[PDB]
Amino acid sequence: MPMQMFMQVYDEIQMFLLEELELKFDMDPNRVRYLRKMMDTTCLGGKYNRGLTVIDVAESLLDGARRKRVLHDACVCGWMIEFLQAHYLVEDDIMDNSVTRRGKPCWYRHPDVTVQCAINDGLLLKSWTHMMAMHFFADRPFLQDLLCRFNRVDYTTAVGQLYDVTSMFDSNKLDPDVSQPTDFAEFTLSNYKRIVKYKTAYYTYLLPLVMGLIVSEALPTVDMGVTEELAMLMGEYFQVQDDVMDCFTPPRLGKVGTDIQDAKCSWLAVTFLAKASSAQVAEFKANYGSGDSEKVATVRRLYEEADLQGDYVAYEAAVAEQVKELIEKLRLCSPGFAASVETLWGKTYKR
Amino acid sequence: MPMQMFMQVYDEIQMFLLEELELKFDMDPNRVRYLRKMMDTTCLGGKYNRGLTVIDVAESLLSDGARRKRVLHDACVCGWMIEFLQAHYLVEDDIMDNSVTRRGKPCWYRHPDVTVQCAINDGLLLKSWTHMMAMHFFADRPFLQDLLCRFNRVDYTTAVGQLYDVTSMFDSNKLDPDVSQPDFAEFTLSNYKRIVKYKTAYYTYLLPLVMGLIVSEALPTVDMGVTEELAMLMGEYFQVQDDVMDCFTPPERLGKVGTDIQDAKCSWLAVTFLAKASSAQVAEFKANYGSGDSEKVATVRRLYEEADLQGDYVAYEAAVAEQVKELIEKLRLCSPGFAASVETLWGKTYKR
Numbered sequence: 001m002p003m004q005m006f007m008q009v010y011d012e013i014q015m016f017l018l019e020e021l022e023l024k025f026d027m028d029p030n031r032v033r034y035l036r037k038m039m040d041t042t043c044l045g046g047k048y049n050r051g052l053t054v055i056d057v058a059e060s061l062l063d064g065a066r067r068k069r070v071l072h073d074a075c076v077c078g079w080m081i082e083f084l085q086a087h088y089l090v091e092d093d094i095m096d097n098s099v100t101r102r103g104k105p106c107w108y109r110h111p112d113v114t115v116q117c118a119i120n121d122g123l124l125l126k127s128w129t130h131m132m133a134m135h136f137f138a139d140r141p142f143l144q145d146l147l148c149r150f151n152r153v154d155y156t157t158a159v160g161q162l163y164d165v166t167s168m169f170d171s172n173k174l175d176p177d178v179s180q181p182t183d184f185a186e187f188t189l190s191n192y193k194r195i196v197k198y199k200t201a202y203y204t205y206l207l208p209l210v211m212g213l214i215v216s217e218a219l220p221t222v223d224m225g226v227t228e229e230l231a232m233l234m235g236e237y238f239q240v241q242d243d244v245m246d247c248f249t250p251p252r253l254g255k256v257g258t259d260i261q262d263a264k265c266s267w268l269a270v271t272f273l274a275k276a277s278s279a280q281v282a283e284f285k286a287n288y289g290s291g292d293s294e295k296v297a298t299v300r301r302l303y304e305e306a307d308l309q310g311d312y313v314a315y316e317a318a319v320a321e322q323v324k325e326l327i328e329k330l331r332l333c334s335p336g337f338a339a340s341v342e343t344l345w346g347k348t349y350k351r
Numbered sequence: 352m353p354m355q356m357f358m359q360v361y362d363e364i365q366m367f368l369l370e371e372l373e374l375k376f377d378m379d380p381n382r383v384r385y386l387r388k389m390m391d392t393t394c395l396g397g398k399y400n401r402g403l404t405v406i407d408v409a410e411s412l413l414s415d416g417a418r419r420k421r422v423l424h425d426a427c428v429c430g431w432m433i434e435f436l437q438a439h440y441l442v443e444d445d446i447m448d449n450s451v452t453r454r455g456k457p458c459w460y461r462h463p464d465v466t467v468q469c470a471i472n473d474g475l476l477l478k479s480w481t482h483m484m485a486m487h488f489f490a491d492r493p494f495l496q497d498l499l500c501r502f503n504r505v506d507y508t509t510a511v512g513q514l515y516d517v518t519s520m521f522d523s524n525k526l527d528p529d530v531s532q533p534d535f536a537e538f539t540l541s542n543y544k545r546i547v548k549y550k551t552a553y554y555t556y557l558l559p560l561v562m563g564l565i566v567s568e569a570l571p572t573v574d575m576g577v578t579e580e581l582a583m584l585m586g587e588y589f590q591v592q593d594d595v596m597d598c599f600t601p602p603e604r605l606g607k608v609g610t611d612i613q614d615a616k617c618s619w620l621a622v623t624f625l626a627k628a629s630s631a632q633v634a635e636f637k638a639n640y641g642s643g644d645s646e647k648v649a650t651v652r653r654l655y656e657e658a659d660l661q662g663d664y665v666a667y668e669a670a671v672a673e674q675v676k677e678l679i680e681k682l683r684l685c686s687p688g689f690a691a692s693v694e695t696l697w698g699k700t701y702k703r
């Protein structure tokens with residue numbers, strides 16, 4: 001029903017955007033059609049959790065008129081985030097030379113899509129966030145504040161990606177003017193935490209919450225400090241759980257996990273590295289980041305014998321407690337908002 | 352002196368940005384330093400025509416020292432928004448086009464310790480930096496919302512221009528993500544004009560003018576209809592002149608060997624030739640165009656000469672110069688300060 005509403009507004013938004021292209025940018029049916037397929041292919045087929053969160057925050061925080069328009073704004077804000085994610089995933093898939101996403105071939109991997117056009121298709125997607133904001137929210141008092149907060153989270157995510165991409169070798173050797181080396185010097189907990197904070201947490205957890213508040217005109221009503229705290233905790237927990245399941249959950253996972261072969265700066269890797277003996281570490285460095293089936297099994301063994309599963313269980317329990325405390329802090333002043341934070345936490349916790 | 356001020360403000364801006372990353376984004380000296388070098392390599396070395404126009408519009412419209420000092424400083428910040436936006440697109444474009452050099456130097460993604468993976472995202476940083484610097488320096492300004500919206504529109508527009516450029520290559524009827532890709536079928540004047548309008552004209556000619564008006568708080572003062580008209584005229588003319596010079600002006604006095612024919616460009620020459628040429632000429636052209644072979648290039652140069660495209664240019668130039676003068680005058684009546692800065696911008700274009 002939320003989904004029904006959300007998908008109906010997508011059509012509304014897609015229609016505006018394509019008509020603007022034709023009426024105001026002189027575009028022709030052929031190219032309009034290319035971009036429609038790009039939109040659809042790129043923006044649809046996920047679970048729209050981030051969009052649907054905005055809707056939920058707003059409905060939680062709620063005369064028919066104010067309702068109808070608050071919920072419509074929520075939907076439009078929802079699609080701003082989905083479009084922004086789509087922007088980053090398109091460029092990421094090019095960056096990472098990946099092959100599929102969501103079952104389907106990556107955008108740039110499609111037969112009549114070039115890398116040349118794909119990169120710029122990506123840019124179009126982010127621009128579309130602005131265009132749909134500026135149109136649907138032209139009259140809203142909150143437009144300026146929405147734009148600025150959105151800009152900040154957009155910036156933040158790109159900074160996340162910088163941290164991800166430079167997680168591979170000693171940052172002391174970072175130098176555009178000097179050829180580049182696969183070492184483990186950046187594989188610390190603090191560096192891991194920082195990638196996940198900025199790459200993921202802000203736009204995945206914070207931004208949906210904040211946008212719910214803005215279109216509800218409720219933003220002053222909540223303690224932002226703890227709201228951010230919540231968002232960072234939940235965001236970090238998402239990726240840690242994923243990292244641990246990639247290793248230790250049988251393909252009931254829905255795929256074969258490849259984090260070890262792909263030489264990932266995962267929670268397992270950095271947590272292992274910090275606690276492991278010199279002998280164990282050396283075995284690790286010798287067997288990590290390779291397709292070879294035995295080398296992989298060696299790393300799984302090392303993880304098992306350092307009881308990283310035990311470490312996760314303790315970590316999860318600690319996170320769950322901090323989260324509940326903060327939610328309660330929230331609920332005291334902001335019961336509607338707190339409730340929806342609870343709901344978001346539930347689609348994450350122990351999946 | 353404008354340039355002196357402009358460069359001073361760059362340092363101010365660079366310093367804010369780098370310190371924000373450190374204080375609010377937890378970033379370490381090592382990675383700060385990488386980004387400083389990216390900013391520098393990437394945003395510096397051009398002639399800063401776009402930035403400097405904003406300053407000039409603003410000075411020209413000045414007509415206590417406090418208002419002066421802050422209006423000019425706002426102009427500088429708007430200047431750098433545009434330079435940074437350009438740098439954003441040029442970084443991504445160089446990757447898109449697998450180019451080798453820009454501005455004498457290696458393309459950013461071409462540097463030894465820059466990967467394509469990192470470089471694409473470096474580019475995104477550049478554009479986010481435009482937002483961050485506006486939101487900081489203009490936090491208190493009444494015109495912040497309107498600046499951001501107008502800026503966003505021209506950002507959008509440029510990317511749409513790139514789409515037109517990139518799909519200039521084969522029948523747009525064959526345009527289909529789900530179907531592998533192969534023409535000259537898109538080489539029409541209309542399509543040429545539309546590439547240049549959206550890729551180039553808005554952010555190169557319109558946006559600088561518009562930003563000068565906003566920080567001058569003078570935007571309502573001017574006929575935007577004709578201002579827009581002029582900006583399109585001047586933008587198109589820029590590329591046409593360049594296109595004709597690529598062919599016909601000697602390496603000595605041009606500063607390079609021009610390669611538009613080898614690179615199979617949708618140039619003004621090519622579309623104008625295609626439109627007027629005889630069936631036989633057209634076949635010769637189609638048989639020789641877009642190849643490094645030195646004979647085939649010379650055949651095209653010959654076809655161009657024999658269709659007197661130089662005469663066609665000379666007439667086009669004259670027609671543009673005149674429309675532009677008419678429109679400036681229209682401007683000058685109500686908005687003499689503005690019109691004069693438009694005249695100055697037009698003079699940095701109208702030869703060399």
Ligand SMILES: O=P(O)(O)C(O)(CCc1cccnc1)P(=O)(O)O
Nearest residue numbers: 088089092093096157161164199200
């Ligand atoms: O590229 P990775 O970090 O693996 C990924 O998580 C995307 C990285 C990313 C970048 C920007 C925003 N969200 C995710 P993927 O598994 O490829 O989706």
Ligand SMILES: O=P(O)(O)C(O)(CCc1cccnc1)P(=O)(O)O
Nearest residue numbers: 200238239240242243246255259264
């Ligand atoms: O599993 P991957 O694509 O790597 C990932 O993108 C998983 C992200 C994800 C999203 C939703 C549900 N499970 C995992 P990661 O980059 O590992 O976090």
Ligand SMILES: O=P(O)(O)C(O)(CCc1cccnc1)P(=O)(O)O
Nearest residue numbers: 437440441444448509513516550551
């Ligand atoms: O590559 P082209 O499109 O010719 C170029 O003109 C790109 C120009 C451009 C593209 C996108 C945004 N601004 C300028 P270049 O000569 O490469 O700089």
Ligand SMILES: O=P(O)(O)C(O)(CCc1cccnc1)P(=O)(O)O
Nearest residue numbers: 551589590593594597607609611616
């Ligand atoms: O000369 P190119 O790099 O191709 C170009 O970028 C011209 C750029 C330019 C700018 C200023 C003066 N001359 C040429 P074009 O792509 O032709 O527009």
Ligand SMILES: [Mg+2]
Nearest residue numbers: 092093096098
């Ligand atoms: Mg990826």
Ligand SMILES: [Mg+2]
Nearest residue numbers: 092095096164
């Ligand atoms: Mg990646």
Ligand SMILES: [Mg+2]
Nearest residue numbers: 242243246259
């Ligand atoms: Mg994973």
Ligand SMILES: [Mg+2]
Nearest residue numbers: 096259262264
């Ligand atoms: Mg991944």
Ligand SMILES: [Mg+2]
Nearest residue numbers: 444447448516
């Ligand atoms: Mg190009």
Ligand SMILES: [Mg+2]
Nearest residue numbers: 444445448450
């Ligand atoms: Mg290029």
Ligand SMILES: [Mg+2]
Nearest residue numbers: 593594597611
């Ligand atoms: Mg040229």
Ligand SMILES: [Mg+2]
Nearest residue numbers: 448611614616
């Ligand atoms: Mg060029």
